[PDB]
């Protein structure tokens, strides 16, 4: 369903956000 | 960030690394406040998105919408919801404010100054600076007094709050003439916490609640000014320990007491926690079952005054140990329950016989049947009823959820208070890292323990 | 019963006052630590 | 007087230390004038002299708006609380003298007096008085004397009097002979004037949007904050509940 | 007006996600804060503008 | 009634003080301990 | 040997296991979805707990002919 | 050899474990054994 | 239910309350990335 | 020469040379615990029967009324009293106080105060000896459990008659009725508590067996191996390296506790946190949150209920429920 698909998209986005920030700070310089 | 070698703290105690970093500690605090406001807004938006208008709030697993409804937004007579847009606005305002608080917290955690003492002496502090500690405490006391006065202003001039004791089954009411009498206000704080007394949980009218909030706001503002303009006295300086961990332990004890008290408010109080929004209390549900089985057998022609059970006490009516006419059965233990649907039926001697014979209102009957069927009993997978009931209904009372969660939180914060008070004493005394192995005190003591 | 209540109130008040003023009596100084 | 919060390099700025390092502040703003927060995002100053004449304009607007904010808010509040003032709402005081109408001047606390001067006489008096006063300001010369404190002064005390801050006749209460408190009061004056300019702009926009004066706005908003605000007056009618 | 509000709220969600992923990255990047001042200020300003715009358009939608 | 009892239960009684002599003995005991501690301070 | 963190941080390990592990997961999924789990382990499908003959739970009462008893009380 | 970070590996593994546990808890309310 | 103009954002509303749970796990991720320094 | 009366009293109270430490927590602990001990012993020996259910149907409890050590108990307070705080001076007579369950509230209140001050006294002596202070934190778990069964559960249920009876068979009655009404076995917090006591037994046996296994030879076979240890010896009495090597070869060379301090922290933290969890489970079921209700969870395609082990447990709980307080219920729902 469209509701379940949008919920899954939002869930994947929020779950991947923080790890992406950490990965980007690891590969882009540091200070983490 | 910092490592263990330069701080002496492992990663699982890494927040201790910023005990003496004022700017980073401030950043952690502001980010955390953003987290709290984020949960408030997100949970409020979740509850309004899942809110269904025809069912009552307590049947829908909601804990914040009852709070805003008790404040008196979007509800009418009988606790009926008229509009959920105020709830949506509350959620949106919290969720937006959480972004600003999160930005401030992330800024002060990452790129803000580590210590505020050099460039920002107004905000800079050391934990042993008792004058600055009392200044910060005074600022926060002033803010808390202003919050209590905000509640007072909402109750008096900005639409009032929901009175469950209003005639006809409760309504949103303007509180005129709050109880400002000091004897009445501080009697609550000096009451016993046991049955029939209930300490401050037994506050039963909005006049008493708002008068107590006037007192709390004025006292908080006056004490805030007092702490801004005073320094702790020598007896206090000898009695206390002056360090960040010690202050944290004091706050942990205070909020543990507050969590236990909030547990008891959620479980027992039906005035500040109206049953229209939170469901019946446990005593309310038991008394409602007794009242419903009284009125049913009265409609079946049985005399509910001369009917005695197997023990001989009385199936429907009996006496409290002080002589009041009360409902029979095990709900005798809840004989001190007071609710808006039963207090019209009570005369000076208790449950009035002629009132129970002739003066029963249909709204009282409906609330009693509803509260009997929605007792605060359920499983943690949300199967309503006693442990032996099958998986038919999906219900756990918000009062049950709040009471269980907040007893757990109060207990853990008591334990954390013990941990931090002990560690603060040991660190001030200088043996929080262990026995010196060269100046061991017990080896200098007389034997035989 | 009132005599018993008066006596028990006196006893409890005495022990609680001892507790309170004992921890008020410079208790953080009562340790073998250095500093 | 801690003058270093307003003058010099370590003065207060329009953005804090983490948001604005003291290298983006324009070079023509180096803490030499009152109210210097280093605020010039669009390069409108470009040099000290242009900044100085813009400060002339800014200070004149500041003083006019400081008078205007009180003149807008006070008669409306007096009329609403029960004074015999007509046209208390600032945008409808002009029409009150249209069809030969007159005004009432409430000399506080002494009482309302009927003003006999008609619109033509009022505007002629205003034109001649304001023209003479502005001409005196730009020329640095004035005809007569008798200001308090300085006393009866000849028509030559204006030489050497700094523009935008002429002492002597315009300073009956002294209060500025000490240079430190004079600079500090300059900072106070420019900050109050900027606040009053923003307040007058707010008065205009609020009056246009809501059809009522700022006193009515503040009183009704304090009566009901969540039921009377900008979004509530933009909504128009009562919203359909989302129940 | 409802579609305008929905577009503005979608843009606000996108800008919020960009700020969430980028502001910590810019802050903890080596000399990233002193170089991305304009981008971060533009993001914060457009975020505040979108919040105010959605609040205004709610009274018309 | 067939027997006497204090009947102090419930009623929201301050510190459970149904007779002012109870408040007086509480105040007296606390003040006596405080006075001993006070005239005995600056002695450590 | 190799200290197992070197193993867990090696592209050779991950290019082997991005094939092996999902194949086993899909094998388990197919084992349940194709009914082979029911066939192998004798658990009744949700529609064949009761037959037309018996509408209650089965009861193995014979021991030395329990094989044919469970064959005739099972889902055929 | 260390070409992929161990913390990244552990984070992905924990994400899959949390996802599988969330699937298991979701299956408590749907399908077989869901009281429905 | 949400207001009708905000109804299409109900799917992203339904995910938000778990983000505070995600923050402490993100702290553990960051500590793992600095190798629990 | 520090002649002051309060100073002398304080130096005696905080003295570490007393055989048993008193302290300021002890000046509350000792009288409350002595009161509770005295009343408990006297009541357990010779108390008259107590109408626990408030239905004028008393329960004997004491040895002189025909109980043995197993069946003897101090019976909880009458259900008619509920939570209403019944002390001796609130009774018309000692006979009425005994009939209504006053000794139970007296003992429970004094015991709660005594164990809280016992925890505080543990902290106080650790402070006076220069020790680290968290033995009190460890002792907070049995304190939490006792508070849950004696105070918190009566608070959540509305009556001290729902407190655990001060006895052995009374404890069993409390457990059985608790399972009947709350399904505590299906509660995850109780599962954590069971894991904690079982793991505490496992880890106590494991640690003791490892230390005894790696004991260094200091004695002979005709002498007890304990004689190889002297009180106050500086050197270690066993081989930590050998014990850790055996443990690693036994299960996994990793997932071990070669740090002795980490090992003892684990031994401290596991049963304490699990007893915290199960005490919180009792405290939550006080407010009727209950264990997992899986009754009739499994249905077939046609909707017929397929009974499970949870359903068998439910049958047992039904038998438990329909028999407890056989004369106390007038209405079908057990809401009170
Ligand atoms: C210097 C600034 C100034 C401003 C901002 C306004 C602004 C306004 N005048 Mg106004 N006036 C100003 C000066 C003066 N007016 C008047 C005489 C009038 C009249 C006679 C009227 C206005 C009116 C108005 C309003 C509509 C145009 C408006 C809000 C009209 C009004 O109030 O309509 C309701 C109107 O009828 N003004 C005089 C005297 C000649 C002024 C002298 O300085
Ligand atoms: C010679 C006559 C002359 C007159 C009548 C005025 C009149 C005025 N000038 Mg001006 N000026 C004059 C000459 C000159 N001025 C200037 C330079 C300036 C400047 C730079 C400014 C003025 C301003 C003002 C106004 C405010 C006056 C003041 O002291 O405010 C201060 C206020 C008081 C002293 C209080 C007065 C009110 C109080 C007594 C009322 C209470 C009365 C009781 C009920 C009794 C006013 C309309 C100001 C202006 O336009 O403001 C909008 C302004 O900024 N003048 C120069 C060059 C140095 C002059 C040279 O001759
Ligand atoms: C002396 C101090 C003793 C305190 C503990 C013992 C008593 C606790 C108690 O009886 O608690 C109950 C009381 C509330 O009492 C109830 O208060 C109720 C008030 O409701 C009344 O008023 C309401 C208002 O709407 C309704 O009208 C309602 O119908 C009406 O009956 C009733 O009076 C009940 O009869 C009465 O029992 O809680 C309170 O006073 C709030 C205080 C918080 C208590 C928290 C309990 C746990 C505390 C510590 C746990 C420590 C853990 C760590 C160590 C281990
Ligand atoms: C107001 C709250 C408060 C504050 C501000 C702190 C602050 C401090 N504590 Mg803590 N603490 C508190 C409450 C508080 N605590 C409570 C409630 C307890 C538990 C009983 C303790 C127990 C305690 C211990 C045992 C220790 C600290 C220590 C510390 C320091 C380092 C913390 C750190 O890095 O943790 C980093 C964070 C973690 C490692 C995460 C832990 C994982 C938790 C358990 C997850 C729980 C989630 C769970 C689902 C929540 C619900 C459970 C239940 C309610 C249902 C720091 C100064 C340390 C210290 O003394 O340093 C000087 C130390 O060792 N504290
Ligand atoms: C409530 C959660 C909370 C808060 C607010 C903090 C706050 C803080 N911790 Mg932490 N921490 C936490 C819990 C928390 N922690 C727990 C659960 C643990 C156990 C793992 C620890 C253990 C710990 C250690 C071991 C240490 C700290 C330290 C720090 C401080 C320095 C931050 C830093 O350099 O990280 C750098 C991190 C990054 C660069 C990556 C994360 C980037 C940001 C923060 C992610 C946020 C995303 C967010 C959605 C963006 C919002 C944008 C906004 C516009 C809306 C910081 C003030 C350090 C310290 O004391 O400093 C001296 C330190 O050594 N923490
Ligand atoms: C968040 C609340 C807060 C905090 C944490 C502080 C903290 C402090 N206050 Mg207090 N105070 C506050 C609010 C607060 N206060 C407000 C609201 C007022 C106005 C009434 C005051 C007025 C004030 C005075 C007048 C004094 C302080 C002082 C003190 C210090 C020692 C107090 C002490 O020994 O505690 C222990 C306190 C008590 C044992 C008193 C309890 C009173 C009874 C027992 C309450 C009965 C009800 C209860 C539930 C049972 C301490 C730094 C002292 C100081 O050093 O000032 C310079 C002092 O003399 N306070
Ligand atoms: C507990 C709150 C707290 C505290 C005590 C501080 C303290 C400080 N901040 Mg700030 N900060 C916070 C919150 C806080 N911050 C938040 C939430 C934000 C996001 C907007 C920031 C973002 C921020 C920046 C980006 C900068 C500072 C910096 C500073 C320093 C001086 C400049 C200043 O006052 O900030 C200025 C902040 C403002 C002007 C915001 C408006 C504040 C007004 C006065 C509102 C007052 C509160 C009011 C009662 C409403 C309460 C809201 C509440 C109910 C949620 C000082 C150390 C500066 C620094 O460290 O320089 C190196 C710096 O550059 N802050
Ligand atoms: C762990 C413990 C702390 C955690 C949580 C604490 C929860 C709540 C704390 C506040 C409870 C209410 C406060 C007022 C209590 C009160 O007034 O009691 C007053 C009550 C009322 O007393 C009774 O009142 C009845 C009528 O309501 C009758 O009149 C009875 O005759 C009368 O005895 O008396 C008591 O309960 C005894 C309290 C004595 C406490 C002594 C122990 C304290 C030890 C250390 C304290 C150090 C300081
Ligand atoms: C039921 C009735 C009892 C009511 C209970 C509540 C009563 C109000 C108690 C509030 C006390 C406020 C805290 C003050 C500082 C406490 C620590 C201290 O003391 O620190 C000590 C500090 C050191 O100088 O002293 C000082 O700063 C001066 C502190 C003043 C001490 C107050 C004493 C008031 C009078 C006491 C009774 C009269 C006693 C006489 C009895 C003699 C025999 C009959
Ligand atoms: C320091 C640190 C930390 C912490 C951090 C934090 C805590 C952060 C945060 C933060 C925050 C706290 C944030 C918040 C936010 C918010 C946001 C970002 C928002 C928004 C918005 C929007 C966009 C919305 C929209 C909407 C609406 C309006 C309504 C309807 C629906 C919707 C949803 C659509 C850690 C631990 C990690 C590590 C260490 C360091
Ligand atoms: C709002 C409200 C109200 C009001 C309330 C109030 C008014 C409250 C208060 C209160 C108060 C007013 C309180 C107080 C308190 C106190 C406390 C809580 C304490 C304490 C402390 C401590 C714990 C101490 C300790 C110590 C000692 C003992 C000695 C040594 C040292 C030290 C200091 C450590 C009412 C109910 C009406 C209604 C409803 C709502
Ligand atoms: Cl039983
Ligand atoms: Cl019953
Ligand atoms: Na029964």
CSV table of C-alpha atoms in Angstrom, one decimal, chain B residues 192-197 263-264 267-268 282 285-286 289-290 293-294 309-311 313-316 318-319 321 328-336 371-373 375-381 383-391 396 399-401 403-405 407-408 411-412 414-415 418-423 425-426 428-429 431-435 437 441-442 444-449, chain J residues 16-19 53-57 79-85 109 119 123 126-134 136-137 140-141 144 147 152 155-162 179-183 186-189 234 261 265 273 276-277 279-280 283-297 314 317-318 321 324-336:
chain,number,residue,atom,x,y,z
B,192,UNK,CA,-0.8,11.5,55.9
B,193,UNK,CA,-0.1,9.5,52.7
B,194,UNK,CA,-2.3,6.6,53.8
B,195,UNK,CA,-5.9,5.6,52.9
B,196,UNK,CA,-8.5,8.3,53.6
B,197,UNK,CA,-5.8,10.9,53.6
B,263,UNK,CA,2.5,7.3,39.8
B,264,UNK,CA,0.1,7.8,42.7
B,267,UNK,CA,-3.5,5.7,39.8
B,268,UNK,CA,-5.7,7.5,42.4
B,282,UNK,CA,-9.2,1.0,40.1
B,285,UNK,CA,-14.1,0.7,38.5
B,286,UNK,CA,-14.8,-1.5,41.5
B,289,UNK,CA,-19.3,-2.6,39.3
B,290,UNK,CA,-20.9,-2.5,42.7
B,293,UNK,CA,-25.0,-4.7,40.1
B,294,UNK,CA,-27.0,-2.7,42.6
B,309,UNK,CA,-24.3,-12.2,51.0
B,310,UNK,CA,-22.8,-15.6,52.0
B,311,UNK,CA,-20.8,-14.1,54.8
B,313,UNK,CA,-22.3,-8.6,55.8
B,314,UNK,CA,-24.5,-7.5,52.9
B,315,UNK,CA,-24.3,-8.1,49.1
B,316,UNK,CA,-24.9,-4.5,48.0
B,318,UNK,CA,-22.5,-2.5,54.2
B,319,UNK,CA,-20.7,-0.2,56.7
B,321,UNK,CA,-15.3,0.9,60.0
B,328,UNK,CA,-20.6,-4.2,49.8
B,329,UNK,CA,-18.1,-6.8,48.8
B,330,UNK,CA,-14.3,-6.5,48.4
B,331,UNK,CA,-14.8,-2.9,47.0
B,332,UNK,CA,-15.3,-2.0,50.7
B,333,UNK,CA,-11.5,-1.5,50.5
B,334,UNK,CA,-12.3,1.4,48.1
B,335,UNK,CA,-15.0,2.9,50.3
B,336,UNK,CA,-13.1,6.2,50.4
B,371,UNK,CA,-16.2,2.2,33.9
B,372,UNK,CA,-17.1,-1.3,35.0
B,373,UNK,CA,-16.3,-2.6,31.5
B,375,UNK,CA,-11.4,-1.3,34.6
B,376,UNK,CA,-7.7,-0.7,34.7
B,377,UNK,CA,-6.9,-4.4,34.3
B,378,UNK,CA,-5.0,-5.8,31.3
B,379,UNK,CA,-2.0,-7.6,30.1
B,380,UNK,CA,1.2,-6.1,28.8
B,381,UNK,CA,0.4,-7.2,25.3
B,383,UNK,CA,-5.4,-7.9,26.4
B,384,UNK,CA,-8.1,-6.3,28.6
B,385,UNK,CA,-9.3,-8.0,31.8
B,386,UNK,CA,-7.9,-10.3,34.4
B,387,UNK,CA,-5.0,-12.7,33.6
B,388,UNK,CA,-7.5,-15.5,33.0
B,389,UNK,CA,-9.6,-13.7,30.3
B,390,UNK,CA,-9.1,-14.6,26.7
B,391,UNK,CA,-7.7,-12.3,23.9
B,396,UNK,CA,-5.0,-1.3,29.0
B,399,UNK,CA,-3.7,5.2,34.3
B,400,UNK,CA,-2.2,1.7,34.5
B,401,UNK,CA,0.5,2.6,31.9
B,403,UNK,CA,1.5,4.4,37.1
B,404,UNK,CA,3.6,1.4,36.1
B,405,UNK,CA,6.0,3.5,34.0
B,407,UNK,CA,6.9,3.8,39.5
B,408,UNK,CA,9.7,2.2,37.4
B,411,UNK,CA,12.7,3.5,41.5
B,412,UNK,CA,15.5,3.7,39.0
B,414,UNK,CA,16.1,6.6,43.5
B,415,UNK,CA,18.8,4.0,42.7
B,418,UNK,CA,22.0,6.4,45.8
B,419,UNK,CA,24.8,5.8,43.3
B,420,UNK,CA,25.6,9.4,42.8
B,421,UNK,CA,25.3,10.5,46.4
B,422,UNK,CA,27.6,7.7,47.5
B,423,UNK,CA,30.1,8.6,44.7
B,425,UNK,CA,30.7,11.7,49.1
B,426,UNK,CA,33.5,9.2,48.3
B,428,UNK,CA,34.8,14.6,48.0
B,429,UNK,CA,36.5,12.5,50.7
B,431,UNK,CA,38.6,7.5,48.1
B,432,UNK,CA,36.3,7.0,45.1
B,433,UNK,CA,39.1,5.2,43.3
B,434,UNK,CA,39.8,2.7,46.1
B,435,UNK,CA,41.8,2.2,49.2
B,437,UNK,CA,47.1,0.5,50.0
B,441,UNK,CA,42.2,3.2,57.6
B,442,UNK,CA,41.1,-0.2,59.0
B,444,UNK,CA,44.9,1.9,61.9
B,445,UNK,CA,41.8,0.9,63.8
B,446,UNK,CA,41.5,-1.0,67.0
B,447,UNK,CA,40.7,-4.7,66.4
B,448,UNK,CA,37.6,-6.8,67.2
B,449,UNK,CA,35.7,-4.6,64.7
J,16,UNK,CA,33.9,2.7,64.1
J,17,UNK,CA,35.1,1.0,67.3
J,18,UNK,CA,31.7,-0.3,68.3
J,19,UNK,CA,31.1,-4.0,67.8
J,53,UNK,CA,-10.6,-10.7,54.0
J,54,UNK,CA,-12.9,-8.3,56.1
J,55,UNK,CA,-15.7,-10.9,55.8
J,56,UNK,CA,-15.8,-11.6,59.6
J,57,UNK,CA,-14.0,-14.9,58.9
J,79,UNK,CA,-9.7,-5.8,54.0
J,80,UNK,CA,-12.2,-3.5,55.7
J,81,UNK,CA,-9.2,-1.3,56.8
J,82,UNK,CA,-7.7,-1.3,53.3
J,83,UNK,CA,-4.9,1.3,53.2
J,84,UNK,CA,-6.2,3.4,56.1
J,85,UNK,CA,-3.2,3.1,58.5
J,109,UNK,CA,6.0,-0.1,58.4
J,119,UNK,CA,20.8,0.4,53.3
J,123,UNK,CA,26.6,3.4,52.9
J,126,UNK,CA,31.5,2.2,53.9
J,127,UNK,CA,32.0,6.0,54.1
J,128,UNK,CA,33.5,5.8,57.6
J,129,UNK,CA,35.9,3.0,56.6
J,130,UNK,CA,37.1,4.8,53.4
J,131,UNK,CA,35.4,2.3,51.1
J,132,UNK,CA,33.5,2.7,47.9
J,133,UNK,CA,29.8,3.2,48.6
J,134,UNK,CA,27.8,0.9,46.3
J,136,UNK,CA,24.1,-0.1,49.5
J,137,UNK,CA,23.2,0.0,45.8
J,140,UNK,CA,18.7,-1.9,47.1
J,141,UNK,CA,17.4,-4.9,45.1
J,144,UNK,CA,13.0,-3.1,46.4
J,147,UNK,CA,8.9,-3.0,49.5
J,152,UNK,CA,3.7,-1.3,46.8
J,155,UNK,CA,-0.9,0.3,47.4
J,156,UNK,CA,-1.7,-0.8,43.9
J,157,UNK,CA,-4.4,-3.2,45.1
J,158,UNK,CA,-6.0,-0.9,47.6
J,159,UNK,CA,-5.6,-3.1,50.7
J,160,UNK,CA,-2.8,-4.3,53.0
J,161,UNK,CA,-4.8,-7.6,53.1
J,162,UNK,CA,-3.0,-8.0,49.7
J,179,UNK,CA,-0.3,-16.0,39.7
J,180,UNK,CA,-4.0,-16.5,39.5
J,181,UNK,CA,-4.7,-12.8,39.2
J,182,UNK,CA,-1.7,-11.5,37.2
J,183,UNK,CA,0.0,-14.5,35.4
J,186,UNK,CA,4.3,-15.1,31.8
J,187,UNK,CA,5.6,-11.7,32.9
J,188,UNK,CA,9.0,-10.8,31.3
J,189,UNK,CA,10.2,-9.1,34.4
J,234,UNK,CA,49.3,-9.6,50.9
J,261,UNK,CA,37.5,-6.6,38.8
J,265,UNK,CA,31.4,-6.4,38.7
J,273,UNK,CA,19.7,-5.9,38.0
J,276,UNK,CA,15.4,-5.0,40.3
J,277,UNK,CA,13.5,-6.1,37.2
J,279,UNK,CA,10.7,-6.3,41.9
J,280,UNK,CA,9.5,-3.8,39.3
J,283,UNK,CA,5.3,-3.3,41.4
J,284,UNK,CA,3.8,-3.0,37.9
J,285,UNK,CA,1.4,-5.9,38.5
J,286,UNK,CA,0.3,-3.9,41.6
J,287,UNK,CA,-1.3,-1.6,39.1
J,288,UNK,CA,-2.7,-4.5,37.0
J,289,UNK,CA,-0.4,-4.7,34.1
J,290,UNK,CA,0.0,-8.5,34.3
J,291,UNK,CA,1.9,-11.1,32.3
J,292,UNK,CA,1.5,-12.1,28.7
J,293,UNK,CA,-2.1,-13.1,27.9
J,294,UNK,CA,-1.8,-15.7,25.1
J,295,UNK,CA,-5.2,-17.3,25.7
J,296,UNK,CA,-6.8,-18.4,22.5
J,297,UNK,CA,-4.1,-16.8,20.4
J,314,UNK,CA,-4.9,-20.6,31.9
J,317,UNK,CA,-5.0,-20.1,36.7
J,318,UNK,CA,-8.8,-20.5,36.5
J,321,UNK,CA,-8.9,-17.9,40.7
J,324,UNK,CA,-9.2,-18.0,46.3
J,325,UNK,CA,-11.3,-16.0,48.7
J,326,UNK,CA,-14.1,-18.4,48.3
J,327,UNK,CA,-16.6,-16.2,50.2
J,328,UNK,CA,-15.3,-12.7,49.6
J,329,UNK,CA,-16.6,-12.1,46.0
J,330,UNK,CA,-20.2,-10.9,45.4
J,331,UNK,CA,-19.7,-9.9,41.7
J,332,UNK,CA,-18.2,-11.8,38.8
J,333,UNK,CA,-15.3,-9.4,37.9
J,334,UNK,CA,-12.3,-9.4,40.3
J,335,UNK,CA,-11.7,-5.7,39.8
J,336,UNK,CA,-10.8,-5.1,43.5
